Amino acid sequence: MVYSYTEKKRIRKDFGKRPQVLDVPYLLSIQLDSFQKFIEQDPEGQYGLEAAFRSVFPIQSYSGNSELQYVSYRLGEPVFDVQECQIRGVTYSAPLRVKLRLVIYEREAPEGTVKDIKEQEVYMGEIPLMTDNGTFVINGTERVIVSQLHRSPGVFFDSDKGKTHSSGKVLYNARIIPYRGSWLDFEFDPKDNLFVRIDRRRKLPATIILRALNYTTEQILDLFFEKVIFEIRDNKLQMELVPERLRGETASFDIEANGKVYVEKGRRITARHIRQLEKDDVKLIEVPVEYIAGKVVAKDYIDESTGELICAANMELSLDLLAKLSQSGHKRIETLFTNDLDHGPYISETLRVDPTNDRLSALVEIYRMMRPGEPPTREAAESLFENLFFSEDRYDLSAVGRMKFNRSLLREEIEGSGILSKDDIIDVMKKLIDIRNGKGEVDDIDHLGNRRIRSVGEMAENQFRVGLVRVERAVKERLSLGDLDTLMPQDMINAKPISAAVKEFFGSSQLSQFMDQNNPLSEITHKRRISALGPGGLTRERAGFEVRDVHPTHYGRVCPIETPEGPNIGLINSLSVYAQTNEYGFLETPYRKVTDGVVTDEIHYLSAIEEGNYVIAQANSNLDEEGHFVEDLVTCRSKGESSLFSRDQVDYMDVSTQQVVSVGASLIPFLEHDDANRALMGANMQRQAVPTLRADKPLVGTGMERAVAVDSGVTAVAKRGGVVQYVDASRIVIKVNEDEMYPGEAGIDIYNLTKYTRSNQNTCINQMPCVSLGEPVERGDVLADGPSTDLGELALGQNMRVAFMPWNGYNFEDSILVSERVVQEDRFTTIHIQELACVSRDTKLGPEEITADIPNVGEAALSKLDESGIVYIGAEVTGGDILVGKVTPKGETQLTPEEKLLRAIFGEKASDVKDSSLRVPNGVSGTVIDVQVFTRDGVEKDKRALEIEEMQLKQAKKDLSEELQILEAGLFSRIRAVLVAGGVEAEKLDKLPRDRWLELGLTDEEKQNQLEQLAEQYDELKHEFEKKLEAKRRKITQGDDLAPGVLKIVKVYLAVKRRIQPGDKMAGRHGNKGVISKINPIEDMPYDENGTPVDIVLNPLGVPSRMNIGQILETHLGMAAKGIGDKINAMLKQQQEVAKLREFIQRAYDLGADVRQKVDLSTFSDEEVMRLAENLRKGMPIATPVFDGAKEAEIKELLKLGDLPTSGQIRLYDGRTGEQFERPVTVGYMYMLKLNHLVDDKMHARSTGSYSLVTQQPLGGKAQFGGQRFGEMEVWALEAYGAAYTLQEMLTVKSDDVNGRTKMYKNIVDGNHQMEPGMPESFNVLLKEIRSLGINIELED
Amino acid sequence: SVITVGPYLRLHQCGLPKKMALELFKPFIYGKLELRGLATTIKAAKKMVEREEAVVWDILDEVIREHPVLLNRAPTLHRLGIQAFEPVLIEGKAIQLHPLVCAAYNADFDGDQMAVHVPLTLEAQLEARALMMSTNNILSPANGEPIIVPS
Amino acid sequence: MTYNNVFDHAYEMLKENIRYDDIRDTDDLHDAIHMAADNAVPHYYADIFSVMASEGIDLEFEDSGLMPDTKDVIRILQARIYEQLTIDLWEDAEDLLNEYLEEVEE
């Protein structure tokens, strides 16, 4: 209870049995890691913006001898406050101060400097900086970029499953992946040959990519086949025998060894026959002739008479060649080895297929193959070969990709240049042949070790590199011919296209998204969201249905639960609780070290490549206090599948039982007892919830609620806290603690409580204080309570008393019956704040300002408006009331000879013809909140916005005056303390103000010191106060950016209170949504023997289908929790002593199983017990973990304390008939939620409105209306009934006629009720369009 | 609107929200206020709708009393996706449905929607009460098994 | 030649679907795209071999999950037009959402 100075008020009874070593993280390391890597400067040239700076600079590109280096990327300051720039509707960005230098060198002067210039600051770049939560603001709206996952550069493999051939033969490939540039892939043929795919083009020949390395074909084949020496010397035909090179050979002839036969025809080639040949020293012996006929000559051989064109490359020997080589007299003849017998000879087949063996012909062929057609020009082929060759600008193999290229080939080095070499493609081909043999398995596509997860910093860097190459293009343009035309302060780079590019990137389509305002656990799972959609994963070379499935690498890195309910299900994997991105970019979950005898408490971070060879134990396994394994056969796993191992074959262990679930579904107790799809459905219920007014705590929680409420940043976290000075409904100030203190900045900190402002999904945000007055706090303790937060603990919904019974039909399958007392308590009364965005159009003619005094408005509506067309703060708009005065400008109508009386009465069309007011479309009611008229530089809007300016000036003075008044009080205290040694006149100090006539003539040394110090400090503090006051005065009343078509943008926040409704979109935490059948009163509902009526009745019949046993245990545990809380409330209302309630609190917080929670009393005594009693009088906050949580015996032994029956079957009565119910109902308490959907928001069926030319599409009855979707299958259903007149209405009269709607309206209103059937004005249009051509339509019977 | 359950209103009857049914029969309200002589002009009837007094609800109860309607989900894979019923005023904004029509609709009560088609002509009223009622169709139109099954 | 007419018809029907269903987010706005992918595609093989002969559509796929696996060519050629229409209409839907907030004076 001494952890964070807020658990002491509310003790959570934890049921965690397994021990925890690693604590709960900050939960924003993924969002902040790339931001603190990109902004913070590294003097070492890797992993930063400085790393991108040193890879492209310095450049001159045209004979200049003038380089450009600027090592300055550290200075940066935001232009305004975060919350102020969020309110003002301006993007939150900061300029980048970059200081440059230039060196001008003379002609033919090596290392000579004749001219230089000094630049202290060059204005380029406006980068938005994220906060500690990770919500940077554009145009007054916070935007969160979703992190992605991309195929990391390295060596990939795929088997292709017989796709392009469709027989069942595998095709192994080795597609090399660079960081940027062209991609290279290899192809297998059905006739066992090799091909090359470059940029998804057609098939290239095989050996052209390897013989272009200034190599010959004979050297390639000598690199292929090794160590075969066949010698012929005077008709010898005797070669070297290799016993160890082969494990078996079919001997078709007699093989003799030094006058005696060694291997006979059809003899044994067993281990004894190999040993008898290896133990005896046998020299070169005779071989049969037919072994030669199956061989291929290897190297470039020349005869004595003839020269070239024989034995060049893969020449199949025949009887005409043996006589030629016997006539030439070749001493050594290199033949084949049949290397890699598991695969077979494949390189010689590709040499036989490919006709070209020359390097220049290979370059001409690849130059004609890259382009669709180009003539060979003897310099284009070398340029296209250099473009494919590894370079610095057009190619990249940075530190992650070079390390993966080293680990793919079992190399020991890690540092190298980002280019391939000559031996690299040979090693890639050797790796492909090694995979073709079988030594080494094919890596799967969906490993987490192959795909790297990238965050917002790498995305911003990859977009900034396009702007940076545009910058160096502009530099190369400016340095052309500009020797004396440099102009270092004048002709710099225009920072407007790079600012437009970064504004487009941070306001992008796929990446940058809006943060959902409901239930800020949804915010922290948007911030921890990893998706595969976007421009980076748009290529999808190797994808399919298997990517959407789950691989066992997804154990503790990400979660298999959190996926959205749209079509993209399986591709968005939320990152788990304990996982952390490595310095390369891959995810690593912690594992603790297990030694032989004890278990070491230190932890390491393991990746996929490490765990592929390591052994990982399960999370739920036994462990004592010392660390000795008492189980002989601990259930474990090696590569993902569980199999039983020994006690010492494992050297790792899970820290806690939390890694397999992320932060989104960690709030649900008993995830074993719920189905996986239903847990996913419960996650989709928890992803949306409006905050409630009461915000009751979760009585059944997991302990994750406090961590989410302290890590999301929606609540104010107190730093360097201590004695609290003043707390009201808008400000919190804290006197600084004496433990840590800044010299000169002791002071107080101001916490401005954000009041009801509009959020993204029309929700209200509010910060209720926690500490009232006079209480010491800790750095890390909470003080404010945000939306869906109860005293710094996450409280999304509220729990109620549930009766498990079938009712009279009001709960059919999963419907919800509620009580009237819930309506009486004003419970989950949603508060929806919408935006009134006013517009003032600027035309070519007329004035620009929108003013008051609009005619054709009654005096009942004009009484609620102030001057210049704004309403008072606190006035209610109901439907068609006027919130802002819409004004059309006085142009376009003054040069009109007609309508002079209309210009005299209702001049220049101040109102429309027949439209509603511009506040909200009709059907609402509610009061205004805040007006946000922001002005332009030189616009004269003082009469409309003087009130907000004076109010914000008073708020700024009240915020920034108290710190300097406390400093002035400390100054006056030092005045009263400094005159103690000389001239004790404290009565004259208390009698006369102003420092006793400003520090009168005391002893001269102390008097001069006092006058100098007080004059210096007082003048500097007054000058600093005046400087801050004038600076903030220039900050508040000024102008901002705006579109030229509009003058001002008025933002009025409009709160709407929505009452109870039968739709309600109501749900729970276990995937059980339901709607309200009817608002049921209190007196006709079941109740127990104590007379407590139930609050909600759901349907148990969905229980064996929705598979929610965790709902049942949560219900039976919340019943015991509220029973203990009700017994505490009864002991409080009986007003018992402290010691009697103390023993009950002790027995309630110690009685149970080994839940290892060593919390106890006698730390605080005789105070703060009544405070926790009044806290926990509404229910006991029992924290039940997910995987190491509660058992049934713990629930029984805790529920026997609350005087309740063990099975949960509490006997109920009836409120309608009064009969005693048989089959005793297990009642309890369930934590319910209200979702985003509303039945009054889904209103439809517009009426007959004006301004409709076809299909009633413009200006119906809605916010924005449109009339369509009768359907394409409902027409066939009406055909299936045989409905003719309903279908006739679906054709012309009700659907597609203008005159017919007026005729039908006259028939209904006048009482005629005449349909007038026929073919109105559609077949007439068909006749006018058919008879327009040279063919007509006659008229007959 | 959102479909809820109604544990009454025998098979040829369903529920309909109040603020929806006040708007669905607005020209019928205008015509019957013209017929009864309560509203002199059309703007007087438009004002009497806006005032929402008791005699307007009396005229609306005279409208909904023996008039049919169509309930029509958006997936109509067969003919029983649209069915004709009789509206009864229900307090709120959601629609109460007969409990046993769920197998013909092939959907559960989790917030699924259903369009409410008003028969505007007399012949459309006869089409609704003669062919498209739930009491007219007891068996299935494809198998012969009865479609109304308790669940 | 004929793909432009299908593109304009799909843009008009998708604009009318977002105008009618009056939703104001980018997460739940996909059912109007399902309206555009199921209505604007041509029915039989005549226009399907006629539209794909015109410019604007290619054979290669952006997403691997939307590709059907069957032996009938007409299902794959219809899902081709549907997938290409959704990919080409996502950005146009977001552009008309950006134009949609201040289009009609109401």
Q: A1231 and A1102 in one domain?
A: yes
Strand partners, A137: A142
The reply to whether B110 sits in an annotated binding site is yes
Which amino acid appears at position B22 of this protein? L
CATH of the domain at A1201: 2.40.270.10
**CA–CA separation, A1243 vs A1263, rounded Å?**
10
Q: A907 and A931 in one domain?
A: yes
Give Dmax over CA atoms of chain A in angstroms.
Answer: 135
Total domains in chain C come to 1
Which residue, A457, A320, A485, A417, is CA-closest to A33? A457
DSSP-assigned letter for residue A968: H
DSSP-assigned letter for residue B146: B
Q: Are the C-beta atoms of B111 and B2 separated by less than 8 Å?
A: yes
- A156 membership: H or E segment, kind and range: none
On the CB side of A861, how many CA atoms lie within 13 Å of its CA? 20
Total domains in chain A come to 9
Strand partners, A141: A138
- A1284 membership: H or E segment, kind and range: none
The token pair at A106 is 């003379």
A1247 located within any domain: no
Strand ranges of the sheet holding A748-752, from the earlier edge strand across to the other edge: A724-727, A731-735, A748-752
Mark out the alpha helices in A216-285 (DSSP H runs). Answer: 217-224, 271-279
Q: Are the C-beta atoms of A244 and A278 separated by less than 8 Å?
A: yes
A510 located within any domain: yes
**CA–CA separation, A202 vs A612, rounded Å?**
37
- A911 membership: H or E segment, kind and range: none
Determine the angle formed by the axes of helices A1138-1150 and A1109-1133, rounding to 10 degrees: 170
Pairing state between β A748-752 and A731-735: antiparallel
Which residue, A760, A761, A1058, A1060, is CA-closest to A923? A1058
Q: Are the C-beta atoms of A194 and A188 separated by less than 8 Å?
A: yes
A400 sits in the region (left: phi over 0; alpha: psi -120 to 50; else beta) called alpha
- Residue among C16, C62, C106 minimizing CB distance to A1257: C16
**CA–CA separation, B51 vs B56, rounded Å?**
9
The token pair at A844 is 């070519």
The residue out of A556, A575, A594 marking a domain boundary is A575
Which residue, A1007, A840, A1021, A868, is CA-closest to A936? A840
A1251 located within any domain: no
**CA–CA separation, B58 vs B29, rounded Å?**
10
- Residue A1065: phi, psi to the nearest 5? 40, 60
| Method of structure determination | cryo-EM
Three-state secondary structure of A1183-1213: ECCCCCCCCHHHHHHHHHHHCCCCCCECCCE
Residues followed by a gap in chain A, C→N > 2.5 Å: none
Strands (E), A715-829: 724-727, 731-735, 748-752, 768-769, 784-785, 798-804, 817-818
Give Dmax over CA atoms of chain C in angstroms.
Answer: 52
**CA–CA separation, C11 vs C79, rounded Å?**
18
The token pair at C20 is 């009618």
Strand partners, A751: A732
- Residue A14: phi, psi to the nearest 5? -85, 140
Helix%, strand%, coil% for chain A, nearest 5: 30, 15, 55
The token pair at B3 is 């479909």
CATH of the domain at C20: 1.20.120.780
CB pair distance less than 8 Å for C27 and A516:
yes
**CA–CA separation, A224 vs A348, rounded Å?**
9
CA A613 remoteness from chain centre? 31
What residues make up the domain containing A312? Answer: 226-343
Dihedral angle, C-alpha A995, A999, A1002, A1008, nearest 10 °: 140
Q: Are the C-beta atoms of A258 and A283 separated by less than 8 Å?
A: yes
**CA–CA separation, A615 vs A1114, rounded Å?**
36
**CA–CA separation, A675 vs A1102, rounded Å?**
13
Pairing state between β A260-263 and A285-286: unpaired
- Residue A392: phi, psi to the nearest 5? -95, -45
Which amino acid appears at position A169 of this protein? K
First-to-last alpha carbon distance for chain C, in angstroms, is 38
CATH of the domain at A924: 2.40.50.150
Determine the angle formed by the axes of helices A1004-1036 and A962-978, rounding to 10 degrees: 180
CB pair distance less than 8 Å for B93 and A1239:
yes
- Residues 6+ away with beta carbon under 8 Å from A878: A924, A925, A926
Q: A325 and A430 in one domain?
A: no
The token pair at A11 is 């003790």
Tell me if residue A328 falls in helix, strand or coil. Answer: helix
Residues 32-91 (B) with a CB less than 8 A from some CB of A: 34-35, 42, 70, 72, 74-79, 81-82, 90-91
Strand partners, B90: B17
What would the DSSP string read from start to end of C5-26?
A: HHHHHHHHHHHHHHHHH----S
Q: A1110 and A1018 in one domain?
A: no
**CA–CA separation, A388 vs A382, rounded Å?**
10
Give the closest-approach CA distance of A904 to chain B in angstroms.
Answer: 27
- In B, which residues are within 8 Å of A1281 by CB distance? 79, 82, 127, 131-132
Alpha-carbon distances of A246 from A6, A240, A274, A337, B148, rounded to whole Å: 76, 13, 10, 10, 78
**CA–CA separation, B129 vs B124, rounded Å?**
9
- The answer to whether A1245 faces chain B, any CB pair under 8 Å, is yes
**CA–CA separation, B121 vs B128, rounded Å?**
11
Nearest CA in chain A to B136: A1281
Positive or negative, the CA dihedral A1017, A1019, A1020, A1024 is positive
- Residues 6+ away with beta carbon under 8 Å from B10: none
On the CB side of A1234, how many CA atoms lie within 13 Å of its CA? 24
- Residue A840: phi, psi to the nearest 5? -130, 105
Three-state secondary structure of A86-147: HHHCCCCCEEEEECCEEEECCCCCCCCCCEEEECCCEEEEEECCCCCCCCEEECCEEEEECE
Residues in chain C: 106
Pairing state between β A700-701 and A1182-1183: parallel
A516 located within any domain: yes
CB pair distance less than 8 Å for A1061 and B116:
no
Three-state secondary structure of A305-371: CCCCCCCCCCCECCHHHHHHHHHHCCCEECCCCCCCCCCCCCHHHHHHHCCCCCHHHHHHHHHHHHC
DSSP-assigned letter for residue A155: B
Is A924 exposed, middle or buried (CB count within 10 Å of its CB: 0-12, 13-18, 19+)? Answer: middle
C22 sits in the region (left: phi over 0; alpha: psi -120 to 50; else beta) called left
Residues followed by a gap in chain C, C→N > 2.5 Å: none
Q: Are the C-beta atoms of A1055 and A832 separated by less than 8 Å?
A: yes
- Residue A614: phi, psi to the nearest 5? -90, 170
CA A104 remoteness from chain centre? 48
Which residue, C39, C4, C8, C29, is CA-closest to C97? C29
Give the closest-approach CA distance of A699 to chain B in angstroms.
Answer: 27
**CA–CA separation, A1208 vs A1114, rounded Å?**
12
**CA–CA separation, B59 vs B36, rounded Å?**
9
The token pair at A280 is 């005896």
A12 located within any domain: no
**CA–CA separation, A1059 vs A937, rounded Å?**
44
First-to-last alpha carbon distance for chain A, in angstroms, is 95
Helix%, strand%, coil% for chain C, nearest 5: 60, 0, 40
- Residues 6+ away with beta carbon under 8 Å from A1058: A829, A830, A832, A1238, A1240
**CA–CA separation, A475 vs A56, rounded Å?**
12
Q: A642 and A560 in one domain?
A: no
Mark out the alpha helices in A209-318 (DSSP H runs). Answer: 217-224, 271-279, 290-293
| Gyration radius of chain B's alpha carbons | 17
Which residue, A761, A845, A698, is CA-closest to A142? A761
**CA–CA separation, A680 vs A349, rounded Å?**
54
Helix%, strand%, coil% for chain B, nearest 5: 35, 20, 45
Compute how many other C-beta atoms are within 10 angstroms of the C-beta atom of residue A765: 17
Q: Are the C-beta atoms of A702 and A664 separated by less than 8 Å?
A: no
Compute how many other C-beta atoms are within 10 angstroms of the C-beta atom of residue C58: 10
A798 located within any domain: yes
Is B116 exposed, middle or buried (CB count within 10 Å of its CB: 0-12, 13-18, 19+)? Answer: buried
In the numeric block, the tokens 């104590």 are attached to A1090
Q: A449 and A550 in one domain?
A: yes
- A1056 membership: H or E segment, kind and range: strand A1051-1058
CATH of the domain at A643: 2.30.150.10
Pairing state between β A68-69 and A700-701: unpaired
The residue out of A1058, A1090, A1125 marking a domain boundary is A1058
DSSP-assigned letter for residue A244: T
On the CB side of A1068, how many CA atoms lie within 13 Å of its CA? 29
- Residue among B92, B99, B111 minimizing CB distance to A812: B99
Q: Are the C-beta atoms of B18 and B90 separated by less than 8 Å?
A: yes
Q: A401 and A285 in one domain?
A: no
**CA–CA separation, A808 vs A795, rounded Å?**
33
DSSP-assigned letter for residue A1268: -
Which residue, A1075, A1073, A1093, is CA-closest to A1084? A1093
**CA–CA separation, A592 vs A1104, rounded Å?**
40
A892 sits in the region (left: phi over 0; alpha: psi -120 to 50; else beta) called left
**CA–CA separation, A1130 vs B43, rounded Å?**
62
- In A, which residues are within 8 Å of C89 by CB distance? none
**CA–CA separation, A557 vs A590, rounded Å?**
10
Peptide bond into A43 cis (omega under 30): no
A1044 located within any domain: yes
What would the DSSP string read from start to end of A1121-1165?
A: HHHHHHHHHHHHHTT--HHHHHHHHHHHHH-SSS------SSSS-
Strand partners, A263: A255
Give the closest-approach CA distance of C67 to chain A in angstroms.
Answer: 9
Q: Are the C-beta atoms of A602 and A593 separated by less than 8 Å?
A: yes
Question: Chain C interface, mutation test: which of A1264, A1272, A1275, most C Cβ atoms within 10 Å?
Answer: A1264
**CA–CA separation, A1163 vs A1161, rounded Å?**
5
Q: Are the C-beta atoms of A144 and A515 separated by less than 8 Å?
A: yes
Q: A1097 and A1225 in one domain?
A: yes
CA A800 remoteness from chain centre? 34
Positive or negative, the CA dihedral A309, A311, A315, A321 is positive
Tell me if residue B35 falls in helix, strand or coil. Answer: helix
On the CB side of A1048, how many CA atoms lie within 13 Å of its CA? 29
Is A1160 exposed, middle or buried (CB count within 10 Å of its CB: 0-12, 13-18, 19+)? Answer: exposed
CB pair distance less than 8 Å for C19 and A1264:
yes
Alpha-carbon distances of A253 from A242, A249, A263, A1076, rounded to whole Å: 17, 11, 8, 92
Number of H helices, E strands in chain A: 35, 43
Q: A634 and A776 in one domain?
A: no
- Residues 6+ away with beta carbon under 8 Å from A247: none
Which residue, A46, A94, A49, A93, is CA-closest to A70? A49
**CA–CA separation, A1046 vs A837, rounded Å?**
12
- In B, which residues are within 8 Å of A1294 by CB distance? 120
**CA–CA separation, B101 vs B87, rounded Å?**
15
Which residue, A1299, A1306, A1304, A1305, is CA-closest to A1325? A1299
Q: A750 and A648 in one domain?
A: no
The residue out of A788, A819, A848 marking a domain boundary is A788
Determine the angle formed by the axes of helices B54-64 and B26-36, rounding to 10 degrees: 110
DSSP-assigned letter for residue A46: S
- Residue A731: phi, psi to the nearest 5? -135, 150
What residues make up the domain containing C33? Answer: 1-106
Q: A1076 and A991 in one domain?
A: no
Q: What angle do CA A320, A326, A332 make, to 5 degrees?
A: 115
- Residue A13: phi, psi to the nearest 5? -80, 105
Which amino acid appears at position B89 of this protein? L
In the numeric block, the tokens 């049942």 are attached to A1112
- Count residue pairs from A and B with Cβ separation < 8 A: 156
Alpha-carbon distances of A312 from A315, A332, A359, A410, rounded to whole Å: 7, 16, 14, 35
Q: A880 and A979 in one domain?
A: no
**CA–CA separation, A65 vs A103, rounded Å?**
9
